[PDB]
RNA sequence: AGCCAGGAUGUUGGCUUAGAAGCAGCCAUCAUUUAAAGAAAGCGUAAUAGCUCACUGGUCGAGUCGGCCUGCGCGGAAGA
């Protein structure tokens, strides 16, 4: 694999939509077969298309260096694999509830399906979302 | 569905039932006979096109009951009935026989997307373009 | 085993070991690749 | 920008050249224009890395000696017959 | 089997192999096989190294042969006493000095040309090395 | 080096004595004593064990990496113990243990009886299975190799004494 | 490098249809899902299956990797 410059174009593409999103969610696949790609990744094409970056670069200094730009509570995610997810279609949409109803959908391990921002807190399955 | 222990991908040339010369003992290896194979598939022959080489994923269970979900016929034979040519690749780097339009193929590629793993319909028609010129076919535009 | 005076790695599983001053090739997959000299 | 740190030669001849070349320092000379030719002495390993680039023989070089900035160009090179090393480089003063 | 046509003389002196070579650079092609050792390359050795080299890459590419034997070598038959004139010419060798480019290759990738010069070097008696065409 | 710079932690209850270059480790499973080469530098001085290259010897880092792994096995062995699982593949391949002697029927014309060393306990819950336990990883590895050397796994049908965690490549007769 | 995963969709890709299904060989040497996956490197199938590897996730924690010029060394090195 090439230099740091092509490792920063993934940081540029990640941060390019951080400052405009509303919600952030966490999902993990340490047992994830490509049937999760069949279900979870094609679930992004139901809403908007391709650009829902579900990238996984959550090293202690790889995805943390792109954190101080906006929503600075993502700096200490560290281990327990994190796939970032942003919610552009609709202010305070239901992608966090899309994973909350996916607990019976091949999602035994999802980094405790925590969720990350809006209350600036921890794990709580929210229900006060606009319909 | 379950993890693979006894089920495989089969049904070469579904125009005629029981592909015993082409496929043969592949489903007969684990636990499945050919007599009941046509019984469950008989509700799926005349509901779709007859004479098309459509594959099906034979699903094998441990309780003598077997189910099936038919998939879309490949781009290997869907370009034969669309362009009107009963041929194939042969040598793709030396001859180009097909003259098929992109609009002529995407009108049946929207039927392909009901089983294909895509997001947008037109985002997956370029995948059949990758099989198009692999056989000696040009997509006019 | 081959006692060829010029031994090399014949696959990805071939490993060079200098046992007791004698350079040997040890392969986990293919026993044919096992050889020693040089 | 190829800057070469070089020194002025004090000795010359067959024995003198082979002696200093064995010390990882092959000789050269800067000539051209109207001044006297300057027999120069320079390190081998420094130029050996710079001469591997295609632009080394096409751009104007700046060989520094005694604090003097000399705009010079590479005219010819005497490579070793079978070793990856240089023996003498003709430098034209341009 | 390289051999000159209608030379001036049938037999010539043994001579000595001293000094350095002249064709020390890759002129025609882009990759070369520079000889490091000092010896004589026979007509068989040059042709044997050629077959193992033009088959190594492909039927494609252009290969240059910078060396030609141009020297007869005599050899006395078995059970013949010394003297009685010079022996009869048997083969043709080429004097090679350290630094002589033996072959030149162009039109192939550098990795593919590396393997061809490795296979050709095994047929040659003297040690050779891989060289490239340097600018100027 | 990288192994030598990783200290092994000694648990509570098991004591390690530093008798110069001789190290004895006592535990509930047993007691293992071992002397090391002079190239290592062993200092307990903690609740763990650290290693380093003693001065003068050039290969001290390579020796300390070996001594770290040996004392790591001497800690696990006296606290948990090592266990090797075997398997007797073949028709009529029975196994029985009489106190400390293992009787094997491997198709020979005479019964073979292997004598276990001191501190080595072997059990046979199945006639085609041998489980053996001990405190030293090196000693029971030789015992498992000795039992395997009687009848090695056949490369045609897998017949012979094999490990439970061993794979066997099987070839054919090329015509029938 | 190890410790825990993916290693996909079309796609039986066509060719003599005996089947060459990522893996005898002829060829394009694709596109999507994308944390990533080559219509494919090995073993393994008549052909499927399967075990993995590339590439990508996490832990980990620092140097590691591949060539060049050389000093001294090893093998090649068997006789009455």
Of D57, D76, D81, the CB nearest to E24: D81
Q: What CATH superfamily is the domain B1-71?
A: Ribosomal protein L11/L12, N-terminal domain (3.30.1550.10)
Q: A touches which chains (3+ CB pairs under 8 A)?
A: B
Residue-range domain boundaries for chain F: 8-80, 86-162
Q: Is A79 on the interface with B (CB under 8 A)?
A: no
Of the candidates D63, D31, D60, the one whose C-alpha atom is nearest the C-alpha of residue D47 is: D63
A107 CA to G21 C1' in angstroms comes to 32
Question: Residue C21 CA to nucleotide G73 C1', Å?
Answer: 12
Which region, left, alpha or beta, applies to residue A25 given φ > 0 means left and ψ of -120 to 50 means alpha? beta
Tokens of F173: 């007769």
d(CA C1, CA C25): 10
Cross-chain residue pair D79–E24, CB shorter than 8 Å: yes
Nearest residue on chain A to B2, alpha-carbon basis: A35
Specify which residue's alpha carbon is closest to the C1' of nucleotide G43: C29
Three-state DSSP class for residue D64: strand
Residues E116 and E61: beta-carbon distance below 8 Å: no
**Record: contact B119-A44, CB cut-off 8 A:** yes
The full DSSP string for B45-92 is HTTS-SSS---EEEEE-SSS-EEEEE-PPPHHHHHHHHHT-----SST
Residues of chain D with Cβ-Cβ distance to E97 below 8 Å are 81
Mapping DSSP onto H, E and C, the string for chain E reads: CCCCCCCCCCCCCCCCCCCCCCCCCCCCCCEEEEECCCEEEEHHHHHHHHHHHHCCCCCCCEEEECCCCCCEEEECCCCCCCCCCCCEEEEEEEEECCCCEEEEEECCCHHHHHHHHHHHHHHCCCCEEEEECCCC
Tokens of F75: 């800690």
Distance (Å, rounded) from C-alpha F35 to C-alpha E47? 65
- Residues in chain E closer than 8 A to D77 (CB atoms): 136
Smallest CA–C1' separation from A81, nucleotide:
G58
Nearest to A26 by CA among A90, A89, A73: A73
- Its CATH class, for the domain covering D1-94, is mainly beta
**What is the residue extent of each domain of chain D?**
1-94
Contact (CB, 8 A) for D60 and E77:
no
Which residue segments constitute the domains of chain E, with CATH numbers given? 21-136 (3.90.1170.10)
Residue corresponding to tokens 């792994």:
F69
Alpha-carbon gap, residue B91 to B17, rounded angstroms: 30
Distance from CA of B56 to the nearest CA of A (A): 18
Contacts of A59 (CB under 8 A, 6+ apart): none
> Would you identify the CATH topology of the domain F86-162?
Outer Surface Protein A; domain 3 (3.90.930)
The reply, when asked if residue C30 is annotated as ligand binding, is no
Which structural technique was applied?
cryo-EM
Chain E, window 55-114: residues with a beta carbon less than 8 angstroms from a chain D beta carbon:
97-99
End-to-end CA separation in angstroms for chain C: 14
Q: Is A92 left (phi over 0), alpha (psi -120 to 50) or beta?
A: left
CATH architecture of F8-80: Alpha-Beta Complex (3.90)
Contacts of F101 (CB under 8 A, 6+ apart): F113, F114, F115, F116
Produce one character per residue of A95-116: b if its CB has 16 or more CB atoms within 10 Å, e if not: bbbbbbebeeebbeebbebbbb
Q: Does D31 touch chain E (CB under 8 A)?
A: no
E101: left (phi over 0), alpha (psi -120 to 50) or beta: beta
Q: Does B47 touch chain A (CB under 8 A)?
A: no
> Least CA distance to D77: which residue of chain E?
E136
Which of A45, A48, A52 should one mutate to test binding to chain B, selecting the residue with the greatest count of B CBs within 10 A?
A45
d(CA B118, CA B127): 10
Q: Which nucleotide is nearest to A83 (CA to C1')?
A: G35
E28 min Cα distance to partner chain D (Å): 18
Q: Would you say C37 is a known binding-site residue?
A: no
Written as six digits, the tokens of D17 are 């050249």
How far apart CA D4 and CA B104 sit, in angstroms, is 68
**Is D55 in the E-facing interface, judged by CB distances under 8 Å?**
no
CB B23 within 8 A of CB B55: no
Mutation test of the interface with chain A: which of B119, B122, B123, choosing the one with the most A Cβ atoms within 10 A? B119
User: Resolution reached, in Å?
Assistant: 2.9
Determine, for residues A45 and B118 on separate chains, whether the beta-carbon distance falls below 8 Å.
yes
Residue A37: Cβ within 10 Å count: 12
As a CATH number, domain B72-141 is 1.10.10.250
C14 labelled as ligand-binding? yes
Domain ranges of chain B: 1-71, 72-141
In strand G, the nucleotides that come within 7 Å of a protein beta carbon are 4-21, 26-28, 30-37, 39, 42-43, 46-50, 55-61, 68-70, 74-77
Backbone angles phi and psi of B107, in degrees to 5: -75, -20
- CB contacts under 8 A, D 56-85 vs E, are 57, 74, 76-77, 79-82
In this structure, the strands spanning D86-92 and D68-79 are: antiparallel
Residue with tokens 């952030």: A24
Q: How far apart (Å, rounded) are the C-alpha atoms in residues B32 and B36? A: 8
**Separation of CA C5 and C1' G78 in angstroms?**
15
CA of D54 to C1' of G37 (A): 40
């Amino acid at each position: 694999m090439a230099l740091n410059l092509q490792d920063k174009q993934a940081i540029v593409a990640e941060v390019s939509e951080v400052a405009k999103g509303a919600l952030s969610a966490v999902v993990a696949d340490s047992r994830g077969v490509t049937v999760d790609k069949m279900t979870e990744l094609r679930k992004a094409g139901r809403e908007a298309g391709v650009y829902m970056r579900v990238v996984r670069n959550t090293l202690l200094r790889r995805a943390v260096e792109g954190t101080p730009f906006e929503c600075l509570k993502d700096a200490f995610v560290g281990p327990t694999l994190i796939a970032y997810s942003m919610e552009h279609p609709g202010a305070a949409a239901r992608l966090f509830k899309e994973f909350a109803k996916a607990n019976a959908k091949f999602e035994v391990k999802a980094a405790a399906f925590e969720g990350e921002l809006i209350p600036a807190s921890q794990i709580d399955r929210l229900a006060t979302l606009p319909t | 569905a379950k993890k693979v222990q006894a089920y495989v991908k089969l049904q070469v040339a579904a125009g005629m039932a029981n592909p015993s010369p082409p496929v043969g003992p592949a489903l007969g290896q684990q636990g499945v006979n050919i007599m009941e194979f046509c019984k469950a598939f008989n509700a799926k022959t005349d509901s779709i096109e007859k004479g098309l080489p459509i594959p099906v994923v034979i699903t094998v269970y441990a309780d003598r009951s077997f189910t099936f979900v038919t998939k879309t016929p490949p781009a290997a034979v869907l370009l034969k009935k669309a362009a009107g040519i009963k041929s194939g690749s042969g040598k793709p780097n030396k001859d180009k026989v097909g003259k098929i339009s992109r609009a002529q193929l995407q009108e049946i590629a929207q039927t392909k997307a009901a089983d294909m793993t895509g997001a947008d319909i037109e985002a997956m028609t370029r995948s059949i373009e990758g099989t198009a010129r692999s056989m000696g076919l040009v997509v006019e535009d | 085993m081959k006692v060829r005076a010029s031994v090399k790695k014949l696959c990805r599983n071939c490993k060079i070991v200098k046992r007791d001053g004698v350079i040997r090739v040890i392969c986990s997959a293919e026993p044919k690749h096992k050889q020693r000299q040089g | 920008m190829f800057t070469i740190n070089a020194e002025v030669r004090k000795e010359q001849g067959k024995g003198a050249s082979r002696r200093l070349r064995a010390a990882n320092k092959f000789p050269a000379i800067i000539y051209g224009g109207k001044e006297a030719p300057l027999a120069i002495e320079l390190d081998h390993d420094k130029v050996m890395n710079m001469q591997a680039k295609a632009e080394f023989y096409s751009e104007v070089l700046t060989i520094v000696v005694d604090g003097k900035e000399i705009k010079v160009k590479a005219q010819d090179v005497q490579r070793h017959p079978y070793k990856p090393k240089l023996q003498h480089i003709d430098f034209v003063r341009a | 089997m390289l051999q000159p046509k209608r030379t001036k003389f049938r037999k010539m002196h043994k001579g000595r192999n001293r000094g350095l070579a002249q064709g020390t650079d890759v002129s025609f092609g882009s990759f070369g096989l520079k000889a490091v050792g000092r010896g004589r390359l026979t007509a068989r050795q040059i042709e044997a190294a050629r077959r193992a080299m033009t088959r190594a890459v492909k039927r494609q590419g252009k290969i240059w042969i910078r060396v030609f034997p141009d020297k007869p070598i005599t050899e006395k038959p078995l059970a013949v006493r010394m003297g009685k004139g010079k022996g009869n010419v048997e083969y043709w060798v080429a004097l090679i000095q350290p630094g002589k480019v033996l072959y030149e290759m162009d039109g192939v990738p550098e990795e593919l040309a590396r393997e061809a010069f490795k296979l050709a070097a095994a047929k040659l008696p003297i040690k050779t090395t891989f060289v490239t065409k340097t600018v100027m | 080096s990288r192994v030598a710079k990783a200290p092994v932690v000694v648990p509570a209850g098991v004591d390690v004595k530093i008798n110069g270059q001789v190290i004895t480790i006592k535990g509930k499973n047993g007691e293992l004593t071992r002397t090391l080469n002079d190239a290592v530098e062993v200092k307990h001085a903690d609740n763990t064990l650290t290693f380093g290259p003693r001065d003068g010897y050039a290969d001290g880092w390579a020796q300390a990496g070996t001594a770290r792994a040996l004392l790591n096995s001497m800690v696990i062995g006296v606290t948990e113990g090592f266990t090797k699982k075997l398997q007797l593949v073949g028709v009529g391949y029975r196994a029985a243990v009489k106190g400390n002697v293992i009787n094997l029927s491997l198709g020979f014309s005479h019964p073979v009886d292997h004598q276990l060393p001191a501190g080595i306990t072997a059990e046979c819950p199945t006639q085609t299975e041998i489980v053996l336990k001990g405190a030293d990883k090196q000693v029971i590895g030789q015992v498992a190799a000795d039992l395997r050397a009687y009848r090695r796994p056949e490369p045609y049908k897998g017949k012979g004494v094999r490990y439970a965690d061993e794979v066997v490549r099987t070839k054919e007769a090329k015509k029938k």
